[PDB]
Amino acid sequence: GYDRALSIFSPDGHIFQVEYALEAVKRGTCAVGVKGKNCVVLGCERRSTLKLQDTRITPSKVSKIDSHVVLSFSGLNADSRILIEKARVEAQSHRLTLEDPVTVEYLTRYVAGVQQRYTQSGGVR
Amino acid sequence: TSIMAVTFKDGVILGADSRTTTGAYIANRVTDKLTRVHDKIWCCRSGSAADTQAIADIVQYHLELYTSQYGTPSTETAASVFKELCYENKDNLTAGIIVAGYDDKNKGEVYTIPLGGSVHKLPYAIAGSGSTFIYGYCDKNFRENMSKEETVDFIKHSLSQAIKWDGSSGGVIRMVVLTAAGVERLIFYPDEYEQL
Amino acid sequence: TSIMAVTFKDGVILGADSRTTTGAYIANRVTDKLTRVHDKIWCCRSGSAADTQAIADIVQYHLELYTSQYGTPSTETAASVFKELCYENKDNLTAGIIVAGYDDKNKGEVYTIPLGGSVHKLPYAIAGSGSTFIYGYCDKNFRENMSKEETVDFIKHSLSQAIKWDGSSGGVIRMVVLTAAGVERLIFYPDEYEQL
Amino acid sequence: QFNPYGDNGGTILGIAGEDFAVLAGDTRNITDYSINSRYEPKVFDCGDNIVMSANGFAADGDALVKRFKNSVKWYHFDHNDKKLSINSAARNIQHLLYGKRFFPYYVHTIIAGLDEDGKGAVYSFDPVGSYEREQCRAGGAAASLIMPFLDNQVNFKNQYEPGTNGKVKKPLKYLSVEEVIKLVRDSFTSATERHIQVGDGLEILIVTKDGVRKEFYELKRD
Amino acid sequence: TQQPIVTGTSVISMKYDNGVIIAADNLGSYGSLLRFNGVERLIPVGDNTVVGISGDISDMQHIERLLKDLVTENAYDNPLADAEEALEPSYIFEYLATVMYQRRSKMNPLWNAIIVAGVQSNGDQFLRYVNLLGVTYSSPTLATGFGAHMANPLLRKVVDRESDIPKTTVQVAEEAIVNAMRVLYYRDARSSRNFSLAIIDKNTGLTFKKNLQVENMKWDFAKDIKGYGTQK
Amino acid sequence: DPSSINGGIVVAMTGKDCVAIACDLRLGSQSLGVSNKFEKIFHYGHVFLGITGLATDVTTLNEMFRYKTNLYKLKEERAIEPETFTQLVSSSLYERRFGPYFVGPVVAGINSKSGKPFIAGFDLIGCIDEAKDFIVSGTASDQLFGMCESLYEPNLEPEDLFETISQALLNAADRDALSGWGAVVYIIKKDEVVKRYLKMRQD
Amino acid sequence: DIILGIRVQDSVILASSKAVTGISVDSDDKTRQLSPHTLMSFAGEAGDTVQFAEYIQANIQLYSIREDYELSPQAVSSFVRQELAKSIRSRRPYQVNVLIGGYDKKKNKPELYQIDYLGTKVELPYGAHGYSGFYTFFLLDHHYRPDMTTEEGLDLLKLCVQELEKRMKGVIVKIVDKDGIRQVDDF
Amino acid sequence: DIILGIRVQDSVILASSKAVTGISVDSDDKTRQLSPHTLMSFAGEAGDTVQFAEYIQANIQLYSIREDYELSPQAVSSFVRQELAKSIRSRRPYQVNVLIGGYDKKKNKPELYQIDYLGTKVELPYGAHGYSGFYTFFLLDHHYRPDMTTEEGLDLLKLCVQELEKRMKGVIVKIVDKDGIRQVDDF
Amino acid sequence: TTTLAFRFQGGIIVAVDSRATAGNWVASQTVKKVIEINPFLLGTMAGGAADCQFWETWLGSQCRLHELREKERISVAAASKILSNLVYQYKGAGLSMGTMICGYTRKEGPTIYYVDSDGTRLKGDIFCVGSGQTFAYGVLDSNYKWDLSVEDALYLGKRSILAAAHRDAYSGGSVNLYHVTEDGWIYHGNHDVGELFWKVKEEEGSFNNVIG
Amino acid sequence: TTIVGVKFNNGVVIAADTRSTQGPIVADKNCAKLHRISPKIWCAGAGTAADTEAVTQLIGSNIELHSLYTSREPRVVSALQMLKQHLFKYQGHIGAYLIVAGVDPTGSHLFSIHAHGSTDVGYYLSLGSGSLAAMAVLESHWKQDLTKEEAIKLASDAIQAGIWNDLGSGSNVDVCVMEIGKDAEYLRNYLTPNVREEKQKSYKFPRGTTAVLKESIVNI
């Protein structure tokens, strides 16, 4: 298979692919999250696309990973869909194995672990 | 076991090996498988030792009673007495018997009673586990009206080959000669028949 | 089945019967049990027909590859390939094979591979269901440095007796002669060998 | 239809003292009713003052002993020559046995040594891998004969003070190594008298803080 | 192997004061048929070791091939192959026992019983036994199968303890071995009159005797045995 | 195995001029204790018999031997001796060679004329085992063998013989799941017989 | 099959399940009065139990008529044990377990016997056949006293029956004492 | 193992026995809410049933989260049938029988499905698993009407439960309708 | 073998016997039938000793790893789930295991889960497992209460084990007691069955059918 | 068990071991395996001990009655025939393997009988689980003409080989010698090469250690 080391170290100690992924995040639309006394608010910006866009069926950025946990993103949309699917599968698996829904920190740690694994594995970006 | 009986010009000759086995162990190096049932009527026994011995005892008893009542029984009568016991008790016994007899009129006669209890009259008969290996040789070498020396040589060669190839047969070669002159016993040791 | 191979002064001769049975029914009166695997290396097959045929095909293929790569294989090499096939697959196959070959230096050679997958080099070999009945006769009649006619007569007599006593063997007698002059085929019909 | 297992007989016994341990074993090896050898030791010193015996199918026992010795060697390699204690050895043997849960070694295992407090220690292992620390434990062909005698003589079972009307049990005392040796010899001589598979010789390994020492005695050869 | 087909009989051996003696007959039997005569079942590995094998003949030939391969592999890149780096009986036995036990663990055993005999470099005798289950043991006398029931009682008459080894000369040991072979030929139905013997001595070299035949037997008394029980 | 259904053990030892026979008291079906008062020892005059095995066979053999000993006394006008009673037991057992009683009988007594203690054991088909030291029977036979080969001494006074046989019985029964719910010991002299009930762990 | 019995100071109480085993709607009685002071309850394979019980009852009634006398409960138990021991060796053995309750008039005491199909007879203060023992013996061991009266024995039996009903309907209860055999109707 | 279900004009009623395999003192529930309007009850070999039910529930909840939509009872039944049909061919098949009750919101109608361990799915007005059918079908055939209300179906179920208790404790009763899934407390 | 565990206002009481048998011969009377998984969890032993020991030690390792990862004490339901999933992975192989996992957490309270080698996993209040479970369960049912004090609960467990050991041939030897509270499990000792029988008979007046 | 029989110049000697076991457990360490059919006719039996004893006793009783009837000393062939027919009638279900030897007015005789009824005649015979080692010794050392002393030594050596090498045989050696003109000589424990050594201590308990509940006197 294809297992080339795409993410490697530069002479100054930087990993260029991670920095370029951060630039890709910079190109994405702007998302915001604020904490309240007893609530969390997520705001997202819609791109000023054509007026012929159908709002009913387009994906709406903010995705419920579980009935108590939501996720928003900024960057490439399809990669975000992949991460969202992995998070949903992991949430269901955890609820199955431990007879309790995931904590927010646990799901965040799982998603961050997936991202780190892609930063360190070969043949992927 | 390798037993046989051969008719020849002057009478009949029975021959046998002497090995009894209980599997791989030789429980008796020196066994006598040639059992007399009447003065000039003998038998070669193969199969279960207990069954053949009991049958031979009963046949000898019946033939003694026949002799006391009716006179000297013929070889055919002795074969018939063996056949009755073998056939009527075939579901409980394992016995292959060769009956060989002499009389003045018929000279020598041989009858074979294999498993099942049927009787077959033959110019010569062979039986036992080691018989299978000499079916050809004997068929290629048997003649009729042979002299005593030729018959002895034929039996010796056949039994030596049977002993050589069969693990259940061995020991010494025993022979009994029934003629008008009477009964003669012969024995041949391995150093004699292994050079053949 | 009754198969054999005999070494003689000028080479080797293989011989076999031609009967194949599926129990009591003779499924083929005329079977060729002598299979060539190389120009002067042949084999006699006994056991499961499918297994022996497949093994012979594979051996012929391997020997062709050997000839293309390394030269003329010896009889010992062919026996070794047969042995590898039989021994490594002995839990799924039933094959008794007699490998007979000729070469200028060693003249004629015979190897036997019985069930299990062991190889034994012999001056002559016999195998099959009907072999048991001729263990004595052959042992009493085999000589060394026999002429071609004597070897043919020996094989004919032995196979005729084996056919006579074995119900699983019969038909015609096929023989293949391997010598310096090459390969010769011979056939003998029942009206010939039944008068022996 | 192959039956990869066997029996091989044999009898072993382990006893733990206040400051010593004892592992004794028969030296007779048999198949069914024939004697393979009259001197085939089954008790070995597996380093770090630990003695071991796996009685039963001889091939499995030899394989297990070899594996445990190799395990001790690699434990020394991987942990800066640290001493392998007796409880750690027991756990490692449990894992070695349970590694063949569905094709087990057909042996009963006993190991002996000193714990970290200097006291004697004996561990017993079933073929599957369960283990326990016991004061006295016999294994093998004649275990059922030996065990009640040691229950009576070591633990003073069913013994009372002569005059208390069975109201005061005979108090326990700490046996010396010589008394343990005498009890072992008597048990094995009785077993030789009554059990067909026991005889020929007896070999005893004694473990103290000074190391491991061996003694041999003859048993009736018939 | 799941069931043997062509099988050899017992191999017997004993240690004496200077070396070891081993012996076995030359018959390969095929289910009560004495089929093959002239099968050598003692394999000398080098000059200080003899391996005697009983059981399936095909597996025996496989083991012979393994031993030859082991010798060839030992000779590679070893200038001391005919010296202190030569193969020893202990090495050969350890290898064979490993093979037997591994093949038993795979339910595909080599249906054999093997005695390895020889002399170590320091001069100590070596004699050990391993079978198809991988069971191994050592004794001053060794025998497998049928011989284990009849040869061992006779040989243990000569060498009953380890203390009897220094008292046993080569002549006494060889006479005992020959007598045991004669007894086996008397009472074993799968045995042959022809056998081979091997003596490994620490002072002299390996002595391999072939074509040995069981000598003068006692058969005359058979002429006195009449029919069973009451005949004559 | 019918012999290992109900359980139970019996021992017998010889003293100086005395004999001793002891038994356990348990009667269970398979692993449930049914009765703790099932004695396996009976006496016909001065001869004592202890039977292990199927409880039904034990009762049947006791009744049959009482029958035969009463008839023997009526015909002979004297009590039967242990040596003759042993032959009687052997013949009675061998008369059922193919439908055998699953029993473990043991005979202990003192010969009236000679004064010598006598002891014997039987298998289920009547094979006689004569011993000068001890006889054991029951489900804990191996444990009893181990205890007896170690504790027994050739000549003991009845007071010492009591302790020896009692300890052997108790320590063999504590290692048998099917044996032990009480224990009885008989010490038998020429002119006196003493019966003692031992204290035991029960379970 | 619930067969249970408790012997108290002056009497014997037997309890037998009033259930059968299909489809029918009855109140089976598994007891036979062998004699005016001896009762037998049975359990086991259907058919064999009734036949064996009737055979025993007929023989005992015949003996009572012949001698104009009542056999003691001990003799009755011995006769039943002999019959079962003979049966176990026969071509078609009886697969029957029995409890025998009686009141010996000569000794003026109650007696309870338990016999199984093999022929094992035991005299007990309380006994059971089947699975009743496994669920009843803890209570019987804890609460039994040899000097209990009839009311105390009935209360203990009621507790035992309730315990049996916990892990399952109704029982038939019989009392044997100096006045003979009676059936409890208030239970 | 009592697993029973009755579909009436506006709802589905499921009944499951509360008992386990021993010695313990609890209130076992053999149902899993697959979705707010779809419930599943199971019976069969212990261990396999709970694992299978949890697997199905997890997959259905995952689909509901992914699509932000609720599968119809028909699609759920088809998915369960496919899983069981795959299982029957596997190395370790599930020995589980299920009843699925639902209220299709699109068609606004109740639906009841019965699936066995082989994978045989049938839609029925009433169904059962085990021996409940053999003792309940006479009453169900005589009394059922497709236009029964909630109370009438509850009464019929009560009669069925009493019939089951006659030839044996208690059942758990669940109702699925337009308002979702609830448990009956007065039963 | 007899094992039992029950919950009450004071926590959990676990009581086991100590006899192991290999047919008719008693192999050991000093067997430990309570697995000390960790200082807060206990697991009983029944069926195969090796399977119970090995897998409950493995369960202790898994609980430790969980507490390292999540920085919280694991739930008894989660540990029993881990064990049940593992044993279900092996179903059909030949494992023999019936165990009670007992614990006490702040959120759940006192909790007992019975886990079997067939995949069964039941939350319960009273469990009795073994060849002598009938007598012990009868005693417990007759005498169980929620408001039992610690001493009464320990005595009840001991009495149930004694009742089982008296009648069951394959049960006995000694009684091992354990009390499980919020802060962990407390060992309450080993009591010889033989002495306990006589002491109980004297104090209660029970077992009148046994001569003492 | 190991049992042997050897002929010599003027008689016959049988010998046996004295161990009887039930599996791997020794049931009797000193058992008599030489049975007296008649004063000069002795049988040694292996296999089932009860069968051997009962069959020898029955045949001996019948032989004694026959001898009284005929006013003649018993013959070995008569005992052989009666044993053979009794064993053949039961089709091997009686597990007795016998070596029967004796002296009668016709001379000295030695026979072997199997459980199925087959009989063999030989100068030297062995039977039992240890018969292979004994037969090895016999084939090693038997000679055509032997004196009484040599025959006794050879039989004892064969029994000793069985004792040493066979697990089911051991303890002592019992011998019986029958000579043509002499009385039969029965040597019980002719050799006792297995004497247990002294124990390391004495386990005699002090009086009062065993707890007792009750005591009573039994009237015999």
Contacts of D142 in chain F (CB under 8 A): 146
> Which domains, and CATH codes, for chain D?
1-222 (3.60.20.10)
Phi, psi angles (nearest 5°) of residue E110: -90, 110
- Report the SS3 class of residue J118: coil
Looking at the 3D structure of chain F, how many domains does it have?
Answer: 1
Cα separation values, G66 from G40, G55, G106, G180, Å: 21, 17, 20, 21
Is J in contact with D (3 or more beta carbon pairs below 8 Å)? yes
Is G in contact with E (3 or more beta carbon pairs below 8 Å)? no
Cα separation values, H145 from H3, H12, H14, Å: 20, 13, 17
- Count the residues in chain C: 196
| Distant-in-sequence, close-in-space partners of F40: CB < 8 Å, separation ≥ 6 | F8, F10, F23, F24, F50, F51, F52, F58
Provide the CATH number for the domain around residue F20: 3.60.20.10
SS (H, E, C) J29-78: CCCCCEEEEECCEEEEEEECHHHHHHHHHHHHHHHHHHHHHHCCCCCHHH
Q: Which residue range(s) make up the domain with I76?
A: 1-212
DSSP D74: H
Is residue B54 within 8 Å of J117, Cβ to Cβ?
A: yes
Tell me how far apart the alpha carbons of residues H4 and H12 are, in angstroms, rounded to a whole number.
11
Cα separation values, F99 from D69, F124, G89, Å: 56, 10, 9
- Report the SS3 class of residue F76: helix
Tell me how far apart the alpha carbons of residues D24 and D146 are, in angstroms, rounded to a whole number.
12
Encoded tokens for G42: 């049975």
Looking at the 3D structure of chain I, how many domains does it have?
Answer: 1
Q: Which residue range(s) make up the domain with F1?
A: 1-203
Cβ-defined contact of I138 to G144 (cutoff 8 Å):
no
Q: What is the CA radius of gyration of chain I?
A: 17
- Report the SS3 class of residue I8: strand
Looking at the 3D structure of chain E, how many domains does it have?
Answer: 1
Give which of E10, E17, E20, E22 is closest to E178, Cα–Cα: E22
Encoded tokens for G108: 């003026």
Is residue J197 within 8 Å of D218, Cβ to Cβ?
A: no
| Type of residue found at B11 | G
Catalytic residues of J: 1
Q: What b/e readout covers B31-65, taking b as 16+ CB neighbours within 10 angstroms?
A: bbbbbbbbebbbbbbbbbbbbbbbbbbebbebbee
The verdict on F149 touching D (C-beta cutoff 8 Å) is yes
| Distant-in-sequence, close-in-space partners of C39: CB < 8 Å, separation ≥ 6 | C183
Beta bridge partners of J26: J21
Closest-CA residue of chain F to J209: F163
Tell me how far apart the alpha carbons of residues C156 and C188 are, in angstroms, rounded to a whole number.
8
Neighbours of chain B (3+ CB pairs under 8 A): C, E, J
Encoded tokens for H25: 């003192």
Interruption sites in chain G after residues (C→N beyond 2.5 Å): 21, 25, 168
Tell me how far apart the alpha carbons of residues I44 and I33 are, in angstroms, rounded to a whole number.
6
Give 3-state DSSP helix, strand, coil % of chain E, rounded to 5: 30, 30, 35
Cα separation values, J68 from E180, H13, J73, J82, J83, Å: 50, 99, 9, 17, 19
Block residue for tokens 């008039």: G105
Phi, psi angles (nearest 5°) of residue J33: -115, 5
**Strand duo F128-130 + J124-127: pairing:** unpaired
Give which of B92, B110, B91, B90 is closest to B100, Cα–Cα: B110
Is residue I34 within 8 Å of I14, Cβ to Cβ?
A: yes
| Distant-in-sequence, close-in-space partners of F199: CB < 8 Å, separation ≥ 6 | D166, I212, J211, J212, J213
Encoded tokens for D92: 């490692």
Q: What is the largest CA-CA distance in chain G?
A: 47
How crowded is residue I113: how many other Cβ atoms within 10 Å of its Cβ?
22
Roughly how many angstroms between the first and final C-alpha of chain G, as a whole number?
A: 19
Tell me how far apart the alpha carbons of residues I14 and I184 are, in angstroms, rounded to a whole number.
13
Encoded tokens for H103: 């209220």
Phi, psi angles (nearest 5°) of residue E96: -65, -40
Provide the CATH number for the domain around residue E43: 3.60.20.10
Q: Residues 3 to 32 of B: which have CB under 8 A from any E CB?
A: 18-19, 21, 24-26, 29-32
Chain E contact residues (CB < 8 Å to B)? 29, 32-34, 146, 186-190, 217, 219-223, 225-229, 231-232
Neighbours of chain A (3+ CB pairs under 8 A): H, I
Closest-CA residue of chain H to I127: H24
Is residue J83 within 8 Å of J98, Cβ to Cβ?
A: yes
Give which of H142, G133, A17 is closest to I166, Cα–Cα: G133
| Type of residue found at F114 | S
Encoded tokens for H127: 């169904």
| Distant-in-sequence, close-in-space partners of C124: CB < 8 Å, separation ≥ 6 | C4, C5, C6, C7, C110, C138, C142
Give which of F60, F59, F62, F51 is closest to F3, Cα–Cα: F51
Half-sphere exposure of E34 (CA within 13 A, CB side): 28
**Helices assigned H by DSSP within J71-185:** 76-89, 131-141, 148-165
Q: Please tell me the experimental approach by which this structure was elucidated.
A: cryo-EM
Give which of G1, G2, G4 is closest to G127, Cα–Cα: G4
**Strand duo G171-177 + B182-188: pairing:** unpaired
Encoded tokens for B37: 């049932």
Contacts of I85 in chain A (CB under 8 A): 97
Contacts of E225 in chain B (CB under 8 A): 30-32
Torsion of CA J33, J35, J40, J41, to 10 degrees: -100
The verdict on A90 touching H (C-beta cutoff 8 Å) is no
Catalytic residue (choose from I1, I44, I99, I111): I1
DSSP D168: S
DSSP J116: T
Cα separation values, H101 from B73, D209, F148, H77, Å: 97, 73, 73, 9
Give which of I190, I198, I196 is closest to I30, Cα–Cα: I190
Closest-CA residue of chain E to D33: E149
| Type of residue found at G11 | S
Tell me how far apart the alpha carbons of residues J187 and J184 are, in angstroms, rounded to a whole number.
10
Q: Residues 25 to 54 of J: which have CB under 8 A from any F CB?
A: 25, 27-28, 31, 48-50, 53-54
Give the one of D145, D158, D166 whose C-beta lies nearest to F146's C-beta: D145
Beta bridge partners of G111: G102
Beta bridge partners of E55: E8, E112
Tell me how far apart the alpha carbons of residues B12 and B108 are, in angstroms, rounded to a whole number.
5
Give 3-state DSSP helix, strand, coil % of chain I, rounded to 5: 35, 35, 30
Give which of F64, F45, F58, F50 is closest to F12, Cα–Cα: F50
* Cα angle: E71, vertex E74, E80; to 5 degrees: 115
Beta bridge partners of E131: E113
Per the annotation, binding residues of I for bortezomib are 49
Is residue B30 within 8 Å of B170, Cβ to Cβ?
A: no
Phi, psi angles (nearest 5°) of residue H49: -65, -50
Give the one of I138, I208, I209 whose C-beta lies nearest to G163's C-beta: I138
Is residue F202 within 8 Å of I210, Cβ to Cβ?
A: yes
Give the one of F32, F176, F182 whose C-beta lies nearest to I26's C-beta: F176
Chain I contact residues (CB < 8 Å to G)? 134-136, 138-139, 141-142, 163, 166-167, 204, 206-209
I1 is catalytic: yes
Encoded tokens for E103: 């093949």
Q: What b/e readout covers H129-156, taking b as 16+ CB neighbours within 10 angstroms?
A: beebeebbeeebeeebeeebeeebbbeb
Encoded tokens for I97: 């295991």
- Count the residues in chain J: 220
Q: Which residue range(s) make up the domain with E115?
A: 1-232
Sheet containing C124-127: give its strands across. Answer: C124-127, C3-8, C11-16, C173-179, C182-188
What is the DSSP track for D1-33? ----------EEEEEE-SS-EEEEEE--EESSS
The verdict on I211 touching J (C-beta cutoff 8 Å) is yes
Cβ-defined contact of F54 to G118 (cutoff 8 Å):
yes
Beta bridge partners of E125: E119
Give which of E28, B136, B17 is closest to C136, Cα–Cα: B136
How far does I194 lie from chain F, in Å, by closest CA? 4
How crowded is residue C28: how many other Cβ atoms within 10 Å of its Cβ?
13
The verdict on F177 touching I (C-beta cutoff 8 Å) is yes
| Distant-in-sequence, close-in-space partners of J70: CB < 8 Å, separation ≥ 6 | none
Is residue C18 within 8 Å of C29, Cβ to Cβ?
A: yes
> Which domains, and CATH codes, for chain B?
1-196 (3.60.20.10)
Phi, psi angles (nearest 5°) of residue E143: -160, 150
**Helices assigned H by DSSP within E56-166:** 57-75, 89-105, 147-158
Contacts of A67 in chain H (CB under 8 A): 65
Phi, psi angles (nearest 5°) of residue E122: -75, -5
Instruction: Write the Ramachandran bin of D103: left for phi over 0, alpha for psi from -120 to 50, otherwise beta.
Output: beta
DSSP E162: G
Q: What is the resolution of this structure in A?
A: 2.0
Provide the CATH number for the domain around residue I121: 3.60.20.10
Neighbours of chain E (3+ CB pairs under 8 A): B, C, D, J
Block residue for tokens 């290396």: C41
Contacts of A100 in chain I (CB under 8 A): 75, 78
| Type of residue found at F182 | G
How crowded is residue I89: how many other Cβ atoms within 10 Å of its Cβ?
9
Phi, psi angles (nearest 5°) of residue E31: 50, 65
Give the one of F32, F34, F60 whose C-beta lies nearest to G122's C-beta: F34
The verdict on C53 touching B (C-beta cutoff 8 Å) is no
> Which domains, and CATH codes, for chain J?
1-220 (3.60.20.10)
The verdict on F74 touching I (C-beta cutoff 8 Å) is no
- Helices H48-67 & A77-98, crossing angle to 10 degrees? 150
- Report the SS3 class of residue I9: coil
Give which of B136, A125, F185 is closest to C2, Cα–Cα: B136
Give the one of E32, E226, E228 whose C-beta lies nearest to B167's C-beta: E32
